[PDB]
Amino acid sequence: VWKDADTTLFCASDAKAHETEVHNVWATHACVPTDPNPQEIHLENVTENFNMWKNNMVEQMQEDVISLWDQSLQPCVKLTGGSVIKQACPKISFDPIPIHYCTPAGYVILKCNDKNFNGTGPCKNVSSVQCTHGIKPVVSTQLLLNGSLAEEEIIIRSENLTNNAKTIIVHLNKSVEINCTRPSNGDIRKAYCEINGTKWNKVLKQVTEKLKEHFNNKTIIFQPPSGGDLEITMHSFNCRGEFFYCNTTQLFNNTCINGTITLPCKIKQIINMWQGTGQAMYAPPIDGKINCVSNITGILLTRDGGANNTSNETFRPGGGNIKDNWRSELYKYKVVQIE
Numbered sequence: 200v201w202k203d204a205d206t207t208l209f210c211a212s213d214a215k216a217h218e219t220e221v222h223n224v225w226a227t228h229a230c231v232p233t234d235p236n237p238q239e240i241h242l243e244n245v246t247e248n249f250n251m252w253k254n255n256m257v258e259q260m261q262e263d264v265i266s267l268w269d270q271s272l273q274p275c276v277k278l279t280g281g282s283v284i285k286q287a288c289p290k291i292s293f294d295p296i297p298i299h300y301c302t303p304a305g306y307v308i309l310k311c312n313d314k315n316f317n318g319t320g321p322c323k324n325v326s327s328v329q330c331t332h333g334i335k336p337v338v339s340t341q342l343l344l345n346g347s348l349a350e351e352e353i354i355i356r357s358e359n360l361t362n363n364a365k366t367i368i369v370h371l372n373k374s375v376e377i378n379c380t381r382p383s384n385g386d387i388r389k390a391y392c393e394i395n396g397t398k399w400n401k402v403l404k405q406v407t408e409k410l411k412e413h414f415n416n417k418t419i420i421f422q423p424p425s426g427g428d429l430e431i432t433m434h435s436f437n438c439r440g441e442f443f444y445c446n447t448t449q450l451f452n453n454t455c456i457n458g459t460i461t462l463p464c465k466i467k468q469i470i471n472m473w474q475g476t477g478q479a480m481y482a483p484p485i486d487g488k489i490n491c492v493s494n495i496t497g498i499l500l501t502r503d504g505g506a507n508n509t510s511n512e513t514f515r516p517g518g519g520n521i522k523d524n525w526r527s528e529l530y531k532y533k534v535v536q537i538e
């Protein structure tokens with residue numbers, strides 16, 4: 200017998216003690232080892248309500264990731280709330296590792312196993328576990344990277360689809376690789392991302408058709424972001440410690456709805472912090488080839504307002520609230536207190 204409750208979680212990982220990589224270093228000091236034989240109890244005839252949009256597990260993961268970046272990715276110059284902090288900004292080893300979120304004694308995590316669960320409402324197939332699956336704290340905008348896939352159909356998630364101010368999370372059921380490179384040899388900040396256009400446009404077509412199910416068969420249109428900071432108008436992410444900003448205009452044109460798509464990218468030293476606390480400047484890129492190959496497993500979208508009297512709905516890539524990134528992985532979990 201249980202009830203919804205919030206409590207302080209702990210984390211578990213397979214971090215290596217001898218690694219200089221910062222996620223490994225952080226988890227070594229902040230997490231415990233994983234359980235090799237974890238127990239999972241599938242509940243019979245239990246109906247539980249979930250709400251991915253009001254889930255304190257998300258706030259707690261955000262707190263960890265902020266602490267990790269605070270300790271590991273200090274900028275040379277930090278501009279915050281009128282203040283100016285300077286410090287050493289060495290180059291680091293950076294590659295996110297899976298982090299498990301776990302309940303202490305007296306509490307348990309309920310997990311929704313409904314295969315096309317949208318993140319809110321009743322779940323029929325519920326199990327109880329001590330820990331979530333391993334979640335890589337990948338920070339990005341526009342495209343969700345290296346995440347878990349939907350098991351059956353593509354899923355559309357939103358706190359309120361009817362409200363265009365609410366972010367939409369698209370959960371893909373098939374990965375599309377994105378290959379990002381700053382080549383060895385020039386403009387040391389010039390880079391690019393390569394994507395299979397045949398694969399991408401097929402998935403995007405599938406996304407279009409799913410969006411139709413939720414928008415009364417209205418015509419679905421993609422357009423590039425309207426305005427805002429570069430972190431939002433561009434697909435921004437971190438590869439090997441370096442901040443990449445990629446132009447996704449070619450990804451979100453409605454015309455291809457086959458060759459390789461080459462997005463122009465740029466490494467930026469000066470960024471608007473996702474922690475929402477001002478600006479930071481980092482050192483120039485390391486030398487040599489900088490390359491990250493990632494699976495696109497999700498998309499963050501914002502819907503255009505003012506389209507009620509037309510047959511079109513317009514969607515633009517978005518993001519910037521990194522909590523939505525954690526939601527995309529934590530949607531199926533909630534914490535309960537046990538008697």
Ligand SMILES: CC1(C)O[C@@H](CN)[C@H](CNC(=O)C(=O)Nc2ccc(Cl)c(F)c2)O1
Pocket residue numbers: 338339340427428430431435436437442470471472473474475518519520521
């Ligand atoms: C436009 C406004 C006020 O709302 C937020 C997005 N809706 C945006 C702040 N968000 C950010 O600055 C941000 O995410 N930056 C950021 C920095 C590095 C990386 Cl790798 C990233 F993926 C994002 O600022």
Ligand SMILES: *[C@@H]1O[C@H](CO)[C@@H](O)[C@H](O)[C@H]1NC(C)=O
Pocket residue numbers: 312313314315323324
């Ligand atoms: C719940 O599990 C049962 C048994 O596998 C399955 O028949 C049913 O489709 C599942 N319900 C959902 C919504 O996934």
Ligand SMILES: *[C@@H]1O[C@H](CO)[C@@H](O)[C@H](O)[C@H]1NC(C)=O
Pocket residue numbers: 345346348373374493494
């Ligand atoms: C990338 O996607 C493929 C296919 O879904 C998967 O096998 C692989 O583990 C993924 N890599 C990640 C999540 O880092």
Ligand SMILES: *[C@@H]1O[C@H](CO)[C@@H](O)[C@H](O)[C@H]1NC(C)=O
Pocket residue numbers: 350351352353354372373405409
């Ligand atoms: C992915 O989901 C779509 C519906 O959104 C479905 O048409 C398609 O068969 C699915 N693909 C895979 C690989 O499961």
Ligand SMILES: *[C@@H]1O[C@H](CO)[C@@H](O)[C@H](O)[C@H]1NC(C)=O
Pocket residue numbers: 317318319320321355356357360
């Ligand atoms: C999720 O499902 C519930 C009912 O099961 C519904 O109220 C809600 O509109 C759905 N959300 C989305 C984004 O489809």
Ligand SMILES: *[C@@H]1O[C@H](CO)[C@@H](O)[C@H](O)[C@H]1NC(C)=O
Pocket residue numbers: 359360361362363
């Ligand atoms: C969803 O958003 C619409 C449009 O803003 C609003 O009218 C409605 O009250 C919202 N629904 C809920 C459940 O809050």
Ligand SMILES: *[C@@H]1O[C@H](CO)[C@@H](O)[C@H](O)[C@H]1NC(C)=O
Pocket residue numbers: 378379380393492
């Ligand atoms: C990434 O793209 C580069 C060419 O830009 C290629 O040499 C490399 O093999 C690619 N990586 C993968 C895994 O395809």
Ligand SMILES: *[C@@H]1O[C@H](CO)[C@@H](O)[C@H](O)[C@H]1NC(C)=O
Pocket residue numbers: 395396397398
């Ligand atoms: C592009 O996508 C198709 C369809 O999946 C795939 O078969 C093909 O190998 C890809 N092209 C390249 C250059 O790998």
Ligand SMILES: *[C@@H]1O[C@H](CO)[C@@H](O)[C@H](O)[C@H]1NC(C)=O
Pocket residue numbers: 411412413414415416
């Ligand atoms: C869209 O059209 C299909 C085919 O006519 C129809 O079966 C379905 O009810 C419609 N879906 C909507 C409006 O969500």
Ligand SMILES: *[C@@H]1O[C@H](CO)[C@@H](O)[C@H](O)[C@H]1NC(C)=O
Pocket residue numbers: 432433446447448
């Ligand atoms: C992306 O590229 C297009 C040209 O392909 C350009 O017109 C547009 O302004 C670019 N977007 C951003 C955010 O710079």
Ligand SMILES: *[C@@H]1O[C@H](CO)[C@@H](O)[C@H](O)[C@H]1NC(C)=O
Pocket residue numbers: 448449452454455
């Ligand atoms: C969208 O992609 C198509 C591919 O043929 C291209 O013709 C068109 O110029 C692109 N639109 C952009 C990049 O704004």
Ligand SMILES: *[C@@H]1O[C@H](CO)[C@@H](O)[C@H](O)[C@H]1NC(C)=O
Pocket residue numbers: 294295337344345436437438439490491492493494
């Ligand atoms: C995604 O996972 C791959 C494989 O571990 C990794 O090489 C790549 O750097 C990851 N991408 C990001 C953005 O972390």
